[PDB]
Amino acid sequence: SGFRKMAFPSGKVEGCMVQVTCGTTTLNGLWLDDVVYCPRHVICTSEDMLNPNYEDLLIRKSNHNFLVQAGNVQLRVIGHSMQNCVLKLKVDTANPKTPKYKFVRIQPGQTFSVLACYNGSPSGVYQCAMRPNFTIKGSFLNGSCGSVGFNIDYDCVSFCYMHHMELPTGVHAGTDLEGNFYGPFVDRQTAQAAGTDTTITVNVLAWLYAAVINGDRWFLNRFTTTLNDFNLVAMKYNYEPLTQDHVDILGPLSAQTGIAVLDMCASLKELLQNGMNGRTILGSALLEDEFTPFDVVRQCSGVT
Amino acid sequence: SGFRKMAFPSGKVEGCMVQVTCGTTTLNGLWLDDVVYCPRHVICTSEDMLNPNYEDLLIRKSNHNFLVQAGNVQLRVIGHSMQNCVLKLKVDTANPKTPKYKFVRIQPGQTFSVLACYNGSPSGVYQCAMRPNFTIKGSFLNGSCGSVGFNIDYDCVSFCYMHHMELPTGVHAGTDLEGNFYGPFVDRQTAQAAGTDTTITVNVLAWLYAAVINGDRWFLNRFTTTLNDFNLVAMKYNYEPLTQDHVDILGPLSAQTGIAVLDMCASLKELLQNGMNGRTILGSALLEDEFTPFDVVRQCSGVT
Ligand SMILES: O=C(Nc1cccnc1)N(CCN1CCOCC1)c1cccc(Cl)c1
Ligand SMILES: O=C(Nc1cccnc1)N(CCN1CCOCC1)c1cccc(Cl)c1
Numbered sequence: 316s317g318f319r320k321m322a323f324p325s326g327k328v329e330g331c332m333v334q335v336t337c338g339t340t341t342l343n344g345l346w347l348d349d350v351v352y353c354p355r356h357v358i359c360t361s362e363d364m365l366n367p368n369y370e371d372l373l374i375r376k377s378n379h380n381f382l383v384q385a386g387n388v389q390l391r392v393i394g395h396s397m398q399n400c401v402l403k404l405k406v407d408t409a410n411p412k413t414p415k416y417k418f419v420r421i422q423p424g425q426t427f428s429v430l431a432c433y434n435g436s437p438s439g440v441y442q443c444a445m446r447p448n449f450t451i452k453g454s455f456l457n458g459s460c461g462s463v464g465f466n467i468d469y470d471c472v473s474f475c476y477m478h479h480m481e482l483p484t485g486v487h488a489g490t491d492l493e494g495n496f497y498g499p500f501v502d503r504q505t506a507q508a509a510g511t512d513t514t515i516t517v518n519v520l521a522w523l524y525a526a527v528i529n530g531d532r533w534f535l536n537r538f539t540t541t542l543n544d545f546n547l548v549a550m551k552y553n554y555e556p557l558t559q560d561h562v563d564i565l566g567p568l569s570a571q572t573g574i575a576v577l578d579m580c581a582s583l584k585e586l587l588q589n590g591m592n593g594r595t596i597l598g599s600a601l602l603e604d605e606f607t608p609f610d611v612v613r614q615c616s617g618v619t
Numbered sequence: 620s621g622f623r624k625m626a627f628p629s630g631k632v633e634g635c636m637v638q639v640t641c642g643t644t645t646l647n648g649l650w651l652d653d654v655v656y657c658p659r660h661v662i663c664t665s666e667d668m669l670n671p672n673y674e675d676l677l678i679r680k681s682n683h684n685f686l687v688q689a690g691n692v693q694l695r696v697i698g699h700s701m702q703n704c705v706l707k708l709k710v711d712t713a714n715p716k717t718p719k720y721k722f723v724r725i726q727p728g729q730t731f732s733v734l735a736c737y738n739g740s741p742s743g744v745y746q747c748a749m750r751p752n753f754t755i756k757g758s759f760l761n762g763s764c765g766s767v768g769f770n771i772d773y774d775c776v777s778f779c780y781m782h783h784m785e786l787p788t789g790v791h792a793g794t795d796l797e798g799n800f801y802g803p804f805v806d807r808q809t810a811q812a813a814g815t816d817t818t819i820t821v822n823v824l825a826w827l828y829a830a831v832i833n834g835d836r837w838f839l840n841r842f843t844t845t846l847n848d849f850n851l852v853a854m855k856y857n858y859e860p861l862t863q864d865h866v867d868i869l870g871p872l873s874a875q876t877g878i879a880v881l882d883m884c885a886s887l888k889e890l891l892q893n894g895m896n897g898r899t900i901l902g903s904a905l906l907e908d909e910f911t912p913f914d915v916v917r918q919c920s921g922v923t
Contacts, residue, residue, distance in 0.1 A: 316789040319758035321743035324734060326630030430628060436923035439625035440744055452902065454623035456921045485620040485834060530789060590897075591904075598756065600895075600904030617760045619740035 318525045318597045320605065321614055322428035322440045323467040330412030333390065334435030335404070335461065336382040343432045343461030344383060344404070345474070345492070347413050351383050351390070351404040352492060353461045354479045355397055356502050364504035373397055378404075384435060385410070399494030400502050401477065415471040418492035423447045424515040424555070426607050427464040427475050431455060443476075444518070444605040447555055448510040449498025450486040451476070464489075469619075482507055514554045515604040517561035520579050522603045524568035525611045526596050533594060535574070538581035545580040552587045564608045622829045622901045624909065625918055626732035626744045627771040634716030637694065638739030639708070639765065640686040647736045647765030648687060648708070649778070649796070651717050655687050655694070655708040656796060657765045658783045659701055660806050668808035677701055682708075688739060689714070703798030704806050705781065719775040722796035727751045728819040728859070730911050731768040731779050735759060747780075748822070748909040751859055752814040753802025754790040755780070768793075773923075786811055818858045819908040821865035824883050826907045828872035829915045830900050837898060839878070842885035849884040856891045868912045 335344040335353045339360060344353035356364065358372045376395070381404050383390040394405030421427065426444045430437050431454060443451045443464060455462065455478055464476025479489045479502055486509055488500040500507055527535065546556050562576045569576050583602070591600055612618075639648040639657045643664060648657035660668065662676045680699070685708050687694040698709030725731065730748045734741050735758060747755045747768060759766065759782055768780025783793045783806055790813055792804040804811055831839065850860050866880045873880050887906070895904055916922075 316760075316785055317756060317758040317791065319743075319745040319756075320624060321735070321745045321758060322626060324629045324633050324741035324744055326628075326633040326741075329628050329630040431625070431921075433921045433923050437628035437630075438921055438923045439623075439918065440628055441623040441625045452621060452623075454621040454625060454918060456620075456919075458921060481620055487621065593894075595905065601899065614743065614758060615760075617735075617737045617742055617762060619737050619742045 316529050318529050318614065320442050322442045323465065325428065325430045325437065325440045327414040327467065327472050328430045328463065328465055329437050330414070331410060332430070332432050332435050332437060333383055333385045337376065337380055341434060342458065343435055345461070345463050345477070346383075346385060346390070346406070346410040347416055349406050349409045351406055352477065353402050353404070354477065354490075354502070355400050355402045355494070356460070356479065357381075357402065361504075366505075367503060369397065400479065400490050400496060401492070401494030417471060417473045419466075419473045419475050420491040420493070420495070421445050421475045421497075423449060424518060424607070425475075426518075426605055426610055427466050429453055429464045429476070429478075430462060431459055432462045433458040442605060444515065445476075445497060446486075447513045447515065449500070450482065450488055450509045450512070453478070453487045455481060455487055463492075482509055484509060511553060514552070514602065516549055516554045516557050516583075517564065517608065518604040518606055519554070519602045520557075520561075520565055520576070520583060521568060521608040521611045522597065522606045523579055523583060524565070524572055524574070525606065525615060527572050527574060528615050529597065531596050534582050534586055534596060536582050536585055538585065539575070539578050540581040540584055541577065542580075545577070545584055548584045548587055554587070567612055568608055620833050622833050622918065624746050626746045627769065629732065629734045629741065629744045631718040631771065631776050632734045632767065632769055633741050634718070635714060636734070636736050636739050636741060637687055637689045641680065641684055645738060646762065647739055649765070649767050649781070650687075650689060650694070650710070650714040651720055653710050653713045655710055656781065657706050657708070658781065658794075658806070659704050659706045659798070660764070660783065661685075661706065665808075671807060673701065704783065704794050704800060705796070705798030721775060721777045723770075723777045723779050724795040724797070724799070725749050725779045725801075727753060728822060728911070729779075730822075730909055730914055731770050733757055733768045733780070733782075734766060735763055736766045737762040746909060748819065749780075749801060750790075751817045751819065753804070754786065754792055754813045754816070757782070757791045759785060759791055767796075786813055788813060815857060818856070818906065820853055820858045820861050820887075821868065821912065822908040822910055823858070823906045824861075824865075824869055824880070824887060825872060825912040825915045826901065826910045827883055827887060828869070828876055828878070829910065829919060831876050831878060832919050833901065835900050838886050838890055838900060840886050840889055842889065843879070843882050844885040844888055845881065846884075849881070849888055852888045852891055858891070871916055872912055
């Protein structure tokens with residue numbers, strides 16, 4: 316019992332973190348096999364960020380200009396290339412701690428753990444979600460760029476995020492491990508405003524199922540609704556529309572609890588319309604949307 | 620920017636987790652040097668939990684009855700002893716992944732990370748606080764016993780908690796690594812009700828300072844208060860009394876923000892008396908108390 320915002324164990328990713336320095340700029344890199352992945356803005360100074368021509372800036376850099384340090388030992392850079400917004404630094408030594416891994420591009424609404432790092436050293440681990448506006452609400456300071464987001468399936472780490480930027484509104488933007496930004500963001504110090512941060516409806520429902528499994532049941536009501544009726548309410552409250560694909564993914568949670576998905580939608584509809592009335596659900600006074608249906612089943616069943 | 624419930628990187632602790640089985644009972648153990656630490660109730664069956672005489676149950680156990688497996692390899696048990704509510708299993712091999720470590724007994728209000736495990740395998744990591752009633756609000760299922768709580772200071776892991784029990788109310792109880800329970804709990808399947816779960820005032824203030832550092836400032840008011848006046852309000856709302864020791868510990872946060880501790884107390888007093896009025900602070904609709912002043916400085920400065 317109990318339900319917590321749980322991150323994956325970070326050990327497998329900690330063994331991959333390195334420090335990358337180019338000139339006066341230092342950030343984090345991810346060392347997998349004989350390649351170190353890092354944000355391409357490591358080649359810039361704060362002044363270059365205004366309107367950088369990365370191809371032109373990169374022409375002035377050689378392998379020996381990229382200083383890669385794993386722990387306290389220096390890695391030898393034997394090649395460098397730019398792929399989208401990341402640099403790939405080929406080193407002469409395969410990371411002996413390279414776990415089984417994949418690079419995945421996640422969809423909005425999906426969750427992942429972040430290992431925040433500074434100077435190639437881990438500071439902490441927390442759970443995030445890719446927002447519907449393609450930002451993440453993280454905890455990152457200057458020097459945290461290159462910190463990664465990931466999921467783990469038994470022994471395989473699926474890397475999904477690399478931190479690049481903080482928007483003037485305090486939310487974060489980054490790329491997948493192929494260097495493509497999530498959303499419309501560009502690696503430039505320019506006016507980039509995020510779109511509507513809508514609530515991830517399917518995740519809120521999964522969290523309401525987690526609440527019922529853990530004894531928090533006050534919000535269950537005598538009502539039901541339809542997808543179309545529920546969606547009229549969801550639009551009004553800036554919630555993502557619920558689809559039959561979302562209902563299907565909630566199937567195992569519905570089966571475990573005996574609460575039909577549309578009945579849970581009617582509970583959610585009343586919570587949106589009436590509020591919490593000073594009450595809490597799983598220690599929260601707001602509807603939590605950064606737990607996927609898979610996260611709920613995983614935590615509630617004890618998957619290792 | 621951004622402020623998250625952040626756990627320590629768990630790698631150093633993941634290298635210590637082992638599976639301990641005695642008869643039909645399997646739980647987690649912590650392997651440090653040549654000793655495996657685990658809850659003494661590994662020697663019981665669910666039926667024995669009603670009123671166990673651990674010294675008597677232990678007489679029927681020999682070294683070969685404790686099955687210790689680290690990953691997929693078996694450890695040889697060459698000694699066993701009981702210290703309070705934990706068993707210490709001496710093995711013939713020192714854990715090669717033993718980090719620098721200490722065993723500490725924490726005070727209520729202090730926070731720590733938990734590496735939830737099942738069958739000696741890590742499932743996830745989350746941040747907890749030792750509540751003022753000596754329970755923790757964790758996320759633990761059957762099989763999670765022996766999972767540990769810890770803090771890290773650069774390269775030294777300070778272990779502070781070992782999970783033993785879930786109370787009928789869904790909150791958790793456990794011991795320090797010397798096997799002494801936090802609070803009045805006993806390792807028995809008996810009526811054990813937790814006391815008042817009061818709010819950790821000094822932590823709420825530290826979190827309000829984190830909110831100001833991150834731009835959430837709507838709650839700052841034109842008022843001040845005194846320790847005695849603030850404490851009259853804190854008693855009414857089941858908050859822990861604030862002492863001059865708490866004010867002193869908030870000194871660095873007060874200096875960084877220029878907001879006097881007693882002025883922040885007056886903001887907190889108005890928040891307690893008036894509520895949030897449907898507003899949020901650092902993405903929360905309630906006053907968060909599981910961040911210490913040290914956690915705030917650490918996260919806000921990027922300590923690795
Ligand atoms: O957002 C950033 N950093 C940051 C700070 C807080 C939290 N998360 C990230 N930067 C700063 C990068 N510069 C490069 C030159 O040396 C100095 C650092 C940034 C600014 C604009 C576009 C991009 Cl892609 C990145
Ligand atoms: O609380 C417990 N487990 C648990 C479950 C969910 C979350 N956290 C912990 N147990 C069960 C232990 N028994 C021992 C025999 O084999 C079967 C398991 C327990 C019950 C009473 C006193 C103590 Cl110390 C422990």
